[PDB]
Ligand binder design. Sequence first.
Ligand SMILES: CCCCNC(=O)c1ccc(S(N)(=O)=O)cc1
Ligand SMILES: [Zn+2]
Length: 258
Amino acid sequence: HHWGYGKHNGPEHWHKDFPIAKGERQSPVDIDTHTAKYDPSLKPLSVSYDQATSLRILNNGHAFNVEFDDSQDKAVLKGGPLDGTYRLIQFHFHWGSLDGQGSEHTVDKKKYAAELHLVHWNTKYGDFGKAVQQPDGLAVLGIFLKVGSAKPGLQKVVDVLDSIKTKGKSADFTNFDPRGLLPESLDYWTYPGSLTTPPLLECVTWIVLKEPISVSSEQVLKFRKLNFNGEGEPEELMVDNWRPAQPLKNRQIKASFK
Ligand SMILES: CCCCNC(=O)c1ccc(S(N)(=O)=O)cc1
Ligand SMILES: [Zn+2]
């Protein structure tokens, strides 16, 4: 009863209620590494999460979000292609029904099993709801997950998923340190794009890390046991909650590394 990922309300249908779906700066995209241009003027990213204050985890019927206190300049992203300071508000993942699909961005048409999105908003706009109406309002740090060794820093998220199995369940989720979800390198590609879910607003500077993190098959299985439906309703497993690659059109993807 609204948009989703099924055959009847999935990404190919979104344009009917969100005509920006066919706009000029939609996300995600395929990152063609033979075409992305190294840009030695790009600055190093500064990811400052030491004071991050997580609050809550919520199943919103499309994914689960871990939300942070963003009332002050605690956990912020600066530098790289960005001007000024972007505050962390929430992170979530997109993932597949099988290990060979699930990421939203692709790298040379390669799909990863999942992708983490750490969502931040530009403090010059005062609040998140103002920021999404601006073309430089958000910065989303995207990180690929490949199936491999377990990620210790993810285990606290995987352990709480039982408690938010269905749409509209939430649980207290404090003292969670998002630093534990970062790879070793912060090398990245960057391009101007959009939210990858309705309302698909064209307000995001994408920063996509080159190095994936590794998660175990038991960890990603736990994501796949979540439900899109609410309690009581017919069970629909929360899998394949990814939007496919959208045309790059007149954009250039920049690499921070050569
Ligand atoms: C008004 C916005 C309400 C829907 N909300 C979002 O806040 C949103 C944030 C990040 C993404 S994503 N997947 O591109 O990181 C998509 C959507
Ligand atoms: Zn996302």
